[model samples]
Structure formats: structure tokens, C-alpha cells
Target: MSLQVNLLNNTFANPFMNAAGVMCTTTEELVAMTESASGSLVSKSCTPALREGNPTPRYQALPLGSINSMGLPNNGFDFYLAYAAEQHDYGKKPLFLSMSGLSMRENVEMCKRLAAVATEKGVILELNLDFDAMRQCLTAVSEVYPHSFGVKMPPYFDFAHFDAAAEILNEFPKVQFITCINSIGNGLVIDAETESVVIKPKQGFGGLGGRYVLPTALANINAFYRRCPGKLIFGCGGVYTGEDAFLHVLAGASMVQVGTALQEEGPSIFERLTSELLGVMAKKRYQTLDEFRGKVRTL
Candidate 1:
């Protein structure tokens, strides 16, 4: 009956949590998550300064899922850092501070600040992966940051990509976890009624999420799960129900992150998702997640 999961040298009551950039932009939304049924909460990705993000019609909800070109709008690094500093006063649930600075220098500066402040707080760092800058930043942060951290990754389509990414990740021993599938990038959706693209950003192209990317998400999660033995894999994208969460665990995800569904359904969805996941566990006659985690059968 326990859905508890241990990650980053800490424990989560369950595996359900909000994906970065969903229901986490403001302090109000973040407080809601802390009071909700989610086992953990992650702040929206922040830059060195505030960003207004893309123009209107940047996000569109469809029957299958959603598409967005939010452009990483956030309240700046100081805002999230302040929240991270006081997170323990709110509750025991772990809080992760996600950062996606616009440049390498900005990223390094933010990490240096966090490293100085993190000595007393339990906040974990979640860095957004920009392949071009990952190696350099990792090297820089590893020198100053003394705490465990993780990277949020973009999905890969081919085995060669999987191999390359895993090889690079294996070099960072401080990286304790990996969140896979940050939406399938640059997807276009068309509205036949008006004969127009749905979103306004990049000529109606945006990152795709929801049911449309579940299979791809699972693939990336399991792929990295197999390839990166030293790191724990987190499943993100297209998880809407308990069964979906269960599938993620079966595919080797230590935790499952909800994005589109949480945006569409709000924090209440965590209760339903966790309950449904437990139902699946009961039907399978399993006592704990460990029994079936990464135990998917190949035919």
C-alpha cells in the first residue's frame, strides 16, 4: 500500500509530482502543490532575470494533448531561491529548484549562488539540458556545487542518440537523476476549420505533450533507465492516470512527472493518479513498487 520512493538521498511519499513549468510559475501555484497530494514539487525553470516569454496564443490544448512555446517565462532565480530557502517551513515534501539560464555564464552564476545558500537547505537542483553547454556547465558546477543534482533531458528518437547522451551523462557522478522527455519539440498542429495553425509562436510550432507523447516518453524513460545504470530515471510527458504512472514505473522510472494533465486538471489530479496507481498495484498482487519497477517483460 506504500507508494513511497527514495530519491536523491531523500524519500517521497509517492511518485507523483508536477513537471516543471506546469502549475509552478507563481508562489500561489507552488504553495498549492505543497498542500496537494503530490509527493514532491519542482519550481518552474528560471533564468537570471524575469522573462515575459513568447506572445499570446503560445499554448493550445487539443483533444490529444497540448502544445506550447512558453519560452521559459519565470520569476527569476532569486524568487525561486527565496522559495527554496523557506520550503522546509511549509512541509516535509522535497522541493526542487529548476534552472535554465539563457547562457553559460548566467547558469554558472546561478549555480554559484545556489551552492553558497544550499549549505543549510535540502533543495535539490534540476538543470535543464542544453547539449551544447552541458559539458562545460557540468564541469564548472561540479567544482562549486557540493550537493546532488540532476538534469532534465529532451527525448531522443534513435539508439545512437540514446548512446551518446548516456555516455555523456555517465561522466558526471554528481548527477543523481534524469528526467526524460521534456515534450517533443517543434510540433505543429493545424485547425481544419479555420485552416490555420493553432499556436502563435514559431509559425504555430511548439513542444508537444499529453497522450500524443506518452509512448515516446516511455521509450526515452526506459531507454535511459537501461543505459544509465548509475542514475535514476524520472518519467515525464503524457501521464494522465494511475495506469499511466504504473506503466512509467514498469518502464524503469523511479518517479513520474505530470505536465499536460496537471495543467489541464490541476493539483486534484494527484490524488486520483496516486489512488489509481495503488489500484493497479493491488490487482497485480504486488506489495511495493520495487516488485514491478523496471520489471517489464519482453516478448
Candidate 2:
């Protein structure tokens, strides 16, 4: 019956939390998660300065799931940093900062500033870095930032890419958690009747979310979980119910994130999903998450 999850030397009440891009944009939103049943909350991926993000109609809720070319909207790193510095209540739940910048220089500068303001005890870092450039910048930041942090990774479809990423990540013992598959990138959706693209940004190209990406998400989680045993795995994408959450952890994800579903269902989804998951556990005669974490069987 225990739902507690241990990550990076910290204990969480449960394994549920909002995906960084979900409801965690402003300080108010972050505070709202504290009032919910989630084990933790994270700030949106941010830049050095405030950004308007993509244009109108940038998001669409499809029958199967959702799509968006949000283009990373946020009030910037300082805004999130202030929240982590002044407002975050770690005792309530962990606050992870999702860090992404417009450029390498900006990324390094922001990482440096985040290091200056937040310590490991109070706040955790989630480096939302590009797949290609992630290793190089991770090397640079890991040298200077002297705390155990986590990385939010794009889904890699190739074993070679997975091996390379695992190699780079394994070099730093401080990189404690690897959040898999930030919405499958660059998908195009067109309105058949209107004969036009669904989203407004990237000429209709945007990251894919929801049920569409579940298989891929589980693949990435299993891949990284098998490849990088030293680091814990966190799953993002296609999680809307307890069964979905069960599958992710079964595939080795220690924690599961709710994105498009949360946007569609709201924070109340947390309680529902938790209740549903616990029901499944009870039916299976399981008492703790560890009993099934990464214990998926294959035939």
C-alpha cells in the first residue's frame, strides 16, 4: 500500500507529478501543485528572458490525444529561480527546475545562475537540453554545478544514439535521474476538412503528445533503464490512467508524469490516477511500488 518513491536521495510521497510543460508555468501554478496529491512539481522549461512562445492556435486537443508547437513559452529563468529561491516549500513536495535556454551561452549562464541560487537540499535541476547538444553542454555544466541533477531527454529511436547518450550520462555520477522522452518532436497534423495544418507554429510541425506517443515513451524508458542502470528513469508521455502509470513503472520508470492528460483532465487527474493505480496493485496483491518497479516480464 506504500506509494512512496525514492529519487536522488529524496523521498516522495508518490510517483505522480506534472510534466514540466503541463500546468507548471507561473509561480501560481507551481504553488497549486503543492496543494494537490502529486509527489512533486517542476517549473516550465525556461529561457533567459520572457518569451511569447508560438502564435495562436498553437495547441489542439485531438480525439486520440493532443498536439502543440508551444515553442517554449515562459517568464524566463529568473522568474523560476525566484520561485525556487523564495517560494518553494520543499517540505510539501520536491520542486524540480526545468532548464532550457535559447543558446549554449545562455544555457551555461542560466545553469551558473541556478547553481548560485539553489542548492541540492531545497531544489533539483532538470536540464531540458537538445539531443544533439546535450552531451557537450552536460559536460560543461557538470564540471561547474556541484550537485546531483537530472536530465530531460528527447526520445532516441536508435540503439546507437541510446548507447552514446548513456555513455555521456554515465560519466557524471551527479546526474541522478533521466526523464525520458519529452514529447516526440516534429510531428505534423493537418485538418482534413480545412486542408490546413492544425497548429500555428512551425508551419504545422510540432511535438507529439498523449496516446500517440505511448509506445515510444515506454521504449525509451525501457531502453535507458536497461542501458543506464546507474541512473533512475522517469517516464513522460501517454500517461492518463493507473494502467498507463503501471506500464511505465513496469518498464523501469520510477516516477510517471502526466502531460496532455493533465491539461485535458486537470489536477484532479492525480487523485484519480493514483486511486486507479492502487486498485490495480491491490488486485495484483502488491504492497509497494518497488515490488514491480522495472519488473516487467517479457515472453
Candidate 3:
């Protein structure tokens, strides 16, 4: 029953929340997420304008996980910003603005506006993109955007990639937090019955989520948590159970996210997951997340 976690010096009711693209595409869904037990809610990653996203069958749910090439479907920055400006309550839960601009210039422009919004009403920004885009945007706006923003990281397989990417990301002190890892991009899935791809986007190529990416998610979270010691890291990918969440925290994630599972089950999931995570703590004779969070051992 006790699941309070802190981020940006604010205490959340619990650490459970929907990932960017799931249950966060519109004002309706944002209201649902806010009304639910989720400790936080975020806007779907927005471009400068509204987008319909990819074609049909873009998201397919499987037994193990899900795959999607949703292509950043959203109501555009201005819409979400208006919703935030008029409706959001920082006292209830933290609302992060997830943004993936089309280009570096757009990211800068959007951040400038977001920075003004943050100053006026205290909204947080999250940059969700690849390393090059992270570098490029930070280079352009790090000085002007004084408010701290969180960066979302894709999964990296090698130490060199981790080091190189962390080197660039660490140079910017304003990136106070990081979320790892976005769905493993460009994965292929086949259906024997149909003899074709599952989704209609990218010629059957889409980001893989759920159980398929849990290992990679943990690896990236731990790697970045170790590499960038000063930054807070959140875990996303392949979490269907409390044990998975516990493992993510053990491996250095400050909070964990639910995607495929939450998309299938809806907001009620936050209650169940927090209960499950709490059950695990009870079995281990632990009382709080801080007691064992990031306490993984090596042999």
C-alpha cells in the first residue's frame, strides 16, 4: 500500500505510469490517466502539428508483448500545451510533455515555447529521440532552456555505444533525468496464417515492446545509470509483472513503466502492479522501494 517515489523533488503517489504512446494520445486519454492510480501522466510525443500516424494495423498485441509503428500520432504541441495550461494540476500528479520534433530546428523551437510554458506554469519536458537528435537539440537549447528536462534513451547493445552516447549526454547538465529504453526500433514479426507482416507501417517494421525487450531495457537502464551517475533513470520495456519491476529497480531504475500490458488492460493496471510490487517487497521483508532499489549484485 506504500509506494511513494520522488522525481524532480516531488513525491508521486506511486511510480506506475503509462509510457508516452500508450493511453496518452489525446485529451480524453490524458484525463483517464490522471483520474487513474498512475503516479504521473505524459502527453503523447507531439510534432509541431497534428498527425494521423502510420497506417492501419500499426499496433498488434501478442502473447509475449506488442509491436507498433504508430509513428508519433498526436494532437500537436499547441493542443497538448493548451490542455496542460488550462487543465493540468501539478498538485495531483506530474505531467510531462513528451516531444519528438521532425528536425533539430523544430525541437529547438518547440523547446523554446515549452521553456516559456514551464516558467509560467511548471510543466516538465521530455526529449524522446536518438542520440544524435539529443546532442543536436541540447547543443542548440541547453543555454536558453533553463528548466531541467529529461531525455529518453533508446536501447544500446555495446559498451562503446553507451560510453559515446553518455559522453555527449553528460556534457549537458540540464538533462536531469533519463528514460530508457524506447521500444527496440525496427523489429520484424511474421504471421504464418497470413504469411505477411503484422503491422502496416514501415513495410512490417516497427518498434518491439513487452517481454521481448525486457533484457535490453534492463541493460540500458543499468548502463546509463552507471555511466551517468548524477542523472535519474526510468525503466521502460518488457515489464508484465512485479518481479520485472523489482528487477528494473534493482538494476538502477528509479521508476518503471508499463506499455503493452497497460495498453491491453487499461488504467486499472496501476493498482494491480503497485500491489504486486508491494507483495514482492513484503515477501522479501522490505518496507520501501528505496531499501532495495538499485542494489543489484555482481559475482
* Predicted structure with the largest TM-score when compared to the true one: 1
Worst 10 residues of 3 by lDDT: 128-137
Candidate 2 whole-model C-alpha lDDT, 0 to 1: 0.87
RMSD per model, one decimal: 1.2, 1.4, 1.3
> lDDT of each structure?
0.89, 0.87, 0.86
Candidate 1, residue 3: Cα displacement in angstroms equals 0.2
Global Cα lDDT for candidate 1: 0.89
lDDT of 2 at 237: 88
* Predicted candidate 2 versus true structure: per-residue lDDT over 104-204, tens digit per residue: 77878887888866664468888886445766788788877878888898899989988888888888888899999798888888889999999887899
Q: Over the stretch 1-299, how does candidate 1's per-residue lDDT look in tens digits?
A: 79999877788999988999999999899999998999998999999999999998888888999999998889999999998886544355888889998777888899989985567777889898745466787888787788889999999999998988888888999998999979899999999999999888799999999999999998999999999989999899899899999999999998899999999999999999989999988998987888888888999
Model 1: residues >4 Å from true position, as ranges? 87-90, 130-132
Residue clash pairs of candidate 1: none
Comparison by TM-score, 1 against 3, better one: 1
How do the residues 179-267 of candidate 3 rate in per-residue lDDT, one tens digit apiece? 99899989899999999999998899989999999999999998998999989888899988888888988888877888999999999
- What TM-score does each of the candidates earn? 0.97, 0.96, 0.96
Ranking by lDDT: 1, 2, 3
Residue pairs clashing, model 3: none
